[PDB]
């Protein structure tokens, strides 16, 4: 099976807890002191926030193929207050996901296609779809209908 056959909300958590094992990915010293986006007003509640972000980023590499810095910044961008003026849509910060991309590439799960972004290695593909097949084999028991 593939990632497409499972909900993303549970899969991102599974991927985060799995990648927490490999030490290639690590929040830098400035990580706990920066909120997850310019569009965000308050700091993340949890401290696992770093490892979800990578777990999100890698997921899109499975879906959107070669995607660079700015489009990813756009996807994570969100709605923010502007005083008396109404809310507006803004873009997430750059380095937060940039260093995540470098960590993912150094881990060997992804590779770079210059001028186009970064794509996912067959190792990363096999890892993600193994997690997905684990999740689907699980989910077929609680939900029989997924066997079809």
């Amino acid at each position: 099976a593939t990632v497409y056959d499972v909900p993303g909300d549970l899969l991102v958590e599974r991927v985060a807890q799995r990648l927490k094992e490999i030490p290639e990915i690590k929040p830098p010293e400035w990580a706990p002191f920066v909120k997850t986006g310019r569009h965000k007003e308050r700091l993340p509640e949890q401290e696992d926030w770093w490892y979800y972000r990578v777990a999100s980023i890698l997921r899109r590499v499975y879906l959107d193929g070669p995607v660079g810095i700015e489009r990813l910044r756009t996807y994570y961008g969100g709605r923010k207050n502007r005083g008396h003026a109404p809310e507006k849509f803004y873009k997430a910060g750059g380095s937060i996901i940039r260093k995540a991309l470098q960590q993912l590439e150094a881990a060997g799960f992804v590779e770079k296609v210059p001028g186009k972004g970064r794509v996912i290695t067959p190792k990363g593909r096999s890892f993600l779809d193994k997690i997905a097949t684990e999740l689907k084999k699980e989910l077929e028991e609680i939900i029989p209908e997924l066997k079809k």
Partner: protein, 131 residues
């Protein structure tokens, strides 16, 4: 501990630490949770179980923020006018510093001080039908 005194100002133990620190003027929620993380504690735990060692850690963090990992830019008054260092103003240390700034603006006869003396907006807001 229904009452927990930190650096001269009381906090209620019912409130979470990230919310308890906000009772300190000169410390906000973004600072509250960030010092919660610096202390290594859960942001949401009850301040009623704040043993005094955590209080000493909090005040010593406030003594020097940069030495405890707090970035130079999370402080309220970075690059202090009198020493060129980044320190997090708080309580009277915030109050008299802003008063010094007001005196600075007044003694220079600048527009900002002119408005500060008259109770007018420093940044050129239009008051034809407002204020």
């Amino acid at each position: 501990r229904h009452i927990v005194r930190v650096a001269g100002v009381d906090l209620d133990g019912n409130k979470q630490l990230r919310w308890a620190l906000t009772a300190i003027k000169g410390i906000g929620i973004n600072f509250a949770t960030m010092v919660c993380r610096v202390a290594g504690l859960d942001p949401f735990m009850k301040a009623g179980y704040l043993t005094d060692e955590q209080v000493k850690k909090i005040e010593e963090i406030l003594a020097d923020p940069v030495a405890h990992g707090i970035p130079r830019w999370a402080v309220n008054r970075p690059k202090d006018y009198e020493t060129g260092r980044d320190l997090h103003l708080i309580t009277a240390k915030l109050d008299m510093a802003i008063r010094e700034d007001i005196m600075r603006l007044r003694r220079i006869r600048a527009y900002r001080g002119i408005r500060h003396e008259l109770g007018l907006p420093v940044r050129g807001q239009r008051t034809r039908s407002n204020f």
